[PDB]
């Protein structure tokens, strides 16, 4: 059992697992082609975990160190960087553990942007 859970205040909460989905833009990362058209283009990489919700997470990886200019060439005077976001996930507790689920956070790459060293 995650011993860290002892240090969480409060230890447990009551939650309705009937998920209320307010997002009408389904598959928001994979439904657009921004990953291809961006000056800081990226590939999405799939991760699958049966003991996690969401079970499938796609994460961005920048294709280039620099950014792509109007000529279609990489310019190293700027940087392709991944935009990171901390998100909530649920995880399944091991069988010998008290309850079935636990709540925690992970850091994921959502997409990439082009940044200049100094503004």
């Amino acid at each position, epitope marked *: 059992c995650p011993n860290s859970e002892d240090k969480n205040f409060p230890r447990t909460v009551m939650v309705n697992l009937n998920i209320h989905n307010r997002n009408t833009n389904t598959n928001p990362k*994979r439904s657009s082609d921004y990953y291809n058209r961006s000056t800081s283009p990226w590939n999405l990489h799939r991760n699958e975990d*049966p003991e996690r919700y969401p079970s499938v997470i796609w994460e961005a990886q920048c294709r280039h160190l620099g950014c792509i200019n109007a000529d279609g060439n990489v310019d190293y005077h700027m940087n392709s960087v991944p935009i990171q976001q901390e998100i909530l996930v649920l995880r*399944r507790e*091991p069988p010998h553990c008290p309850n079935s689920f636990r709540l925690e956070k992970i850091l994921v790459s959502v997409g990439c942007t082009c940044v200049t060293p100094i503004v």
Partner: antibody
Amino acid sequence: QVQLLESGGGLVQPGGSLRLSCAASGFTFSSYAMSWVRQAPGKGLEWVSTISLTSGFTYYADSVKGRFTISRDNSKNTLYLQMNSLRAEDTAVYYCARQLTLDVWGQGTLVTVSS
Amino acid sequence: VLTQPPSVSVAPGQTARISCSGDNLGDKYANWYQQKPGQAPVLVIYDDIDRPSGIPERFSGSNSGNTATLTISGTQAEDEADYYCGSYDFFLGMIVFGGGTKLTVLG
């Protein structure tokens, strides 16, 4: 090449027991979740069990809970299905499959339970 | 409990649509499998909208509310098969299948 090969299927009496094996090749077996899916002749697909890549996590359909046991031997790249207390309605072709997406399937092995 | 129509018919070169509906389907990805006679099922769409390498572009997937849909544009005679939708439920810890849909190409 990526491949899954089932074996161990055959005739068994009601109440009998049977162990199925699934030998994997052409990919890093230990990096994937693995599953058993069965299909009765002329019928639809029915998920039997899934084992995670992570040790200690197994999953079962209600109809086989307490009777079937899924396990894996990563050193042998093999998936197993121990089937106990077999019922006539367990008769089906049993498929081995990879990931929760079930992206690669074996050719299947026929389990017949009958007197 | 995923629900598919038992049967769908379509004219050659026309668009085929196969729906799959169930409670809470909107909070998890759906997959689609094609099964021809005497063959193991083949994944044709996963994570709602993604095509495995080797699957023709005419196969497309979509999802709306608690309904997933398999769409085949310009349906060919070789597309005749049984189609199953499937999904993994984290909370129940189960994989669920639809009843399947037999696709018939007319003419």
